[PDB]
Ligand binder design. Structure first.
Ligand SMILES: OC[C@H]1O[C@H](O[C@H]2[C@H](O)[C@@H](O)[C@@H](O[C@H]3[C@H](O)[C@@H](O)[C@H](O)O[C@@H]3CO)O[C@@H]2CO)[C@H](O)[C@@H](O)[C@@H]1O
Length: 441
């Protein structure tokens, strides 16, 4: 039910949506087309649900890592920029929004996490993660803390996890191997273990989130934080004098932040694709438009060459790009969301103590990696054997088992309803219910 003759835009609540709304108001005056900018929570999760039936915004803003999943699901229109417009943007940013040979979004800005530190508490920031524990002890004797940052989102903890060898998907010459995940190798384990020890030795608190960390840094309570360029404007208001620098090294190796490219995608079900392209190309992606958003919340290093050549003179931008060079630009493949969900659970479970690092990351490795088809078939054989162990007197049990799985596909049965059908059929014991979940998660 996307209405024709208007533009509805979704953008995350930490970006400069008020500045984006002003670009929209200039668009409305020139064209008569009302532009509405909304920032719903979890918009990156709501968009696949509403767009699939033809609803949702005309334009969705998010980092490029979500967009490949959207495109594979037929939710994004293909971008049709003339060659002259494409030359206005850096080629590596166009690469970030390319999926299966097609441009599926307009890139806006390059984002990378940096180390933000209080120059009146810490004139020289630490070069290594390893010295932070003793630095915290010295600062705790002066009524301060060393480091506070968002421990709830794996975006913020991944640079340390990846530093010694962790990775999301192995890049093998032009394709990401969705079967080669590096979430439970020795490097990822060493990085998450340093994180959990920081919490264990009371240098960080597992409950710290984005807002707790931002308030503590902007009040001068903690000497360091980890954040992106969108956070700089609130620090400008705070009276804290801060520097933006390269993240600390772990085991002598640089932290590797996942680099995001903020991108605007056009809903495939939108009846306003021409209006969306005009707004994005001729209003937002200009010096005038980006400055309007950038003055609300800084965007990072923008994709537009003309505006970025002036933004690159900021040492905070130069530090952002230095951290980007040491990190890796994110894959956009559809498997990214499962990777992020798996790592979020692992960090949270390990940080709180509910699981060891090794257990937490082994479960995340299985959740993020594609199935080993030879392994699962052997488990299917073991599962069949288990049925015969407990139901030797029910010769029709396999016929009814297959019927459930067939009807699942033929009639679009919800998965949890399939689960109830399995537990009722195997009414004797629920081990067959637990064993079944792996085959259909
Ligand atoms: O943790 C569960 C969430 O995992 C996924 O979110 C990813 C994003 O897809 C990824 O872009 C990055 O988000 C950051 C974003 O780039 C930045 O502009 C914003 O200001 O900060 C974000 C970090 O909070 O990292 C997160 C993972 O932390 C998934 O898409 C999302 O639905 C899950 O809820």
């Amino acid at each position: 039910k996307i209405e024709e003759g208007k533009l509805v835009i979704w953008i995350n609540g930490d970006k400069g949506y008020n500045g984006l709304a002003e670009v929209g108001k200039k668009f409305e005056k020139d064209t008569g087309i009302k532009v509405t900018v909304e920032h719903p929570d979890k918009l990156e999760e709501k968009f696949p649900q509403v767009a699939a039936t033809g609803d949702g915004p005309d334009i969705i803003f998010w980092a490029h890592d979500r967009f490949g999943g959207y495109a594979q699901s037929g939710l994004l229109a293909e971008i049709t920029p003339a060659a002259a417009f494409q030359d206005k943007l850096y080629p590596f940013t166009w690469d970030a929004v390319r999926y299966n040979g097609k441009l599926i979004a307009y890139p806006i800005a390059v984002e990378a996490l940096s180390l933000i530190y209080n120059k009146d508490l810490l004139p020289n920031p630490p070069k290594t993660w390893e010295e932070i524990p003793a630095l915290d002890k010295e600062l705790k004797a002066k009524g301060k803390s060393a480091l506070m940052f968002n421990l709830q989102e794996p975006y913020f903890t991944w640079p340390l996890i990846a530093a010694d060898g962790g990775y999301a998907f192995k890049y093998a010459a032009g394709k990401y191997d969705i079967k080669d995940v590096g979430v439970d190798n020795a490097g990822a384990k060493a990085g998450l273990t340093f994180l959990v020890d920081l919490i264990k030795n009371k240098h960080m608190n597992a409950d710290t989130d984005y807002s707790i960390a931002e308030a503590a840094f902007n009040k001068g309570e903690t000497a360091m934080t980890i954040n992106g360029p969108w956070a700089w404007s609130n620090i400008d208001t705070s009276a804290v004098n801060y520097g933006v620098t390269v993240l600390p090294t772990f085991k002598g190796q640089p932290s590797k932040p996942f680099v995001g490219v903020l991108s605007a995608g056009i809903n495939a079900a939108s009846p306003n694709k021409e209006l969306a392209k005009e707004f994005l190309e001729n209003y937002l992606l200009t010096d005038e438009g980006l400055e309007a958003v950038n003055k609300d919340k800084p965007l990072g290093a923008v994709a537009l060459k003309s505006y970025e050549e002036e933004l690159a003179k900021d040492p905070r931008i130069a530090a952002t790009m230095e951290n980007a060079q040491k990190g890796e630009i994110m894959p956009n493949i559809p498997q990214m969301s499962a990777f992020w969900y798996a790592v979020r659970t692992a960090v949270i479970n390990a940080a709180s103590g509910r699981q060891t690092v090794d257990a937490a990351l082994a479960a995340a490795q299985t959740n993020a990696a594609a199935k080993n088809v030879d392994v699962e078939f052997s488990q299917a054989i073991s599962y069949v054997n288990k049925i015969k162990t407990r139901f030797a007197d029910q010769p029709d049990i396999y016929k009814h088992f297959l019927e459930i799985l067939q009807t699942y596909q033929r009639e679009q049965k919800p998965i949890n309803e399939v689960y109830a059908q399995v537990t009722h059929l195997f009414q004797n014991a629920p081990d067959l219910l637990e064993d079944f979940k792996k085959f259909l998660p």
